């Protein structure tokens, strides 16, 4: 756990422009691993915040007309500042509104990681694709979709699912950690977007190892939290997830990581 | 527990336009009973979302000028789509601002359930929850749920009084704003819902609250909230049937 | 615990205009001590809400162009209604945008408590450009701020500082786990509001009791045998606030004058 040690020591300022359902959970997840979250949404303070920040998360869960301009503006401010952007195109497949916005954003700014479930990333690369908010199952290959998305955007792609897929540069990786209770907790993937941002340390082209570690730290903590004897369900799980992220050590991480290339 | 089994299996898409204090808790309550919550607030996507959704919740807890037009617009889009609306007129009696807005909304769109406490519903129409709920039903021709010590439901020609739940619910900020969401989860795209679905929504919620508050690890309103979510997640037919408490009136008028 | 008993009995309507990360936790914190929170943000209902309310919290954690005017308007409405205001200038030192806004607000309205950490309050007074002839500890900063604003100052930190009228106090309760929970200080702003009972110039004893209740509850929660970290801490903090009694309070309070 190279990068996590550095997060706990350096306390990286991690800006989050995220959706209204998950702000509190995202901030508590970041605080638990030692990062310094800031949910700054005013374009007027983006320049000064971004100079000293290590990453920015943009998550469009609750996109409205009031957000659209601000989001484009702060993405551009981030590019000018060399601040890496993690982008979560939540439920992009569910509306033509979200598809058009995501297209505009990816034409207006370079992002450093694109993270979503299989249907979300599919809808990005194929605008006839369709979803609810959740992901169509049996999607074709998360691996094939991630590789196609990488070729199009030349940006690291993370596809979450039963198993998680990461594509960066010439490598593709499949990870197989976590718990089913994660899917019954509303912040989870939106929180993962924030955690990934916490691992970037101002690298606009992040090392795949940093992404692998972000996802594995999150999923291993979930795994362990769900095994706790006081985990009685999705309610009690969530405080335990945060405890487990706080205490996670090298030994547990190395014992539990499940990873495979190509 | 006819309806709850179906929610767990079908995973109904349940749109929530609700207040900024309760969004997270409402989404988690829904997820715990197997629904699929989506807090979509842009009128620009309402048409597409609503076509495939099973209900919409409108809760005005944190109503501001920025919400007013959007809410009226999406309620109209829900009506055009045949998507049932649950309406929570939060604190409508506390300001003329809310009274005027609720009036405009109910003049602009047909809703499928109106839910509040007694003084909220009273303030809508202008202690005795049953009478108030009947009066409100006559005016709006829409199912009324009034929450209180005992809960009242009026739909079509029936009125019912329910007596489940816990005092700790009143010391948790999401509770009733969550109940609005849960009820939306039980609608399955019926614009005129069966009273049995509303009875089940309310009883599931209150029975889970009862059982959560009896848990040995419940030490107060803090620990009660996670346990409430656990208990909604696990709630079974046996516990439901053992604990439900009802009282009742048939054949009312027009 | 004079004031806390009265909160549990009287159930004071406490209006919170606070940031989007902490609304729910602030409402639950207020509910747990017996207060009645209302997160009303429309200027259009402020006059009616404020007539019957006991305090207003204003916390600028997620300040945007859409908040600025509304916040100035409601502060003015609060002044006209005699409703006391607790003001949390979150991260004011981090941008010119926040510095200018906090200035505008404090030129536009009289607040009843100003709460922040040392570097927030220091940035407030450094930007007033009044401190001719001015390392600095919290006590000195709080006194400098009091002289400028003539308004109770609470500075949170390792030890907490309160300055009201001619007294300064240093408190030493709490837990490090508080710093690892995102609502905490923003919640303390709301708890302090809950203790004001419509006093625009609150007695320092009320402010002492607000802060000590909060920090003593945090202390006890963190000792609980089911507290395994910042996650489980938060629900136990709410439980502890709900059950906190006179005996625990008197046993644990740690307080020193100037």
Residue numbers in the entry:
A (entry chain A): 1 to 262
B (entry chain B): 1 to 126, 140 to 267
C (entry chain C): 1 to 134, 139 to 262
Task: Please quote the paper that reports this structure.
Here we report a detailed structure-function analysis of the kinase ThiM, which phosphorylates THZ in one of the first steps in vitamin B1 biosynthetic pathway. The following β-sheet strand 7 is antiparallel to strand 6 and following β-sheet strand 8, which is antiparallelly flanked by β-sheet strand 9. This fold of the phosphotransferase ThiM is homologous to that common to the group of ribokinase-like folded kinases.
In an attempt to achieve a maximum in accuracy and reliability of the structure, micro crystals grown under microgravity conditions onboard Chinese space mission Shenzhou-815 were used to prepare seed stock solutions to grow crystals suitable for X-ray diffraction. The homologue structure of Bacillus subtilis ThiK (PDB code: 1C3Q19), sharing 38% sequence identity, was used as a search model for molecular replacement phasing. The core of each monomer contains nine β-sheets that are flanked by five α-helices and six α-helices. For all six molecules in the asymmetric unit no electron density was observed for the last two residues of the C-terminus and for the loop region between residues 126 and 140. Therefore these residues were not modeled. Analysing the interface regions of protomers A, B and C revealed that 10 intermolecular H-bonds support the complex formation. No Mg2+ ion was found in the native structure.
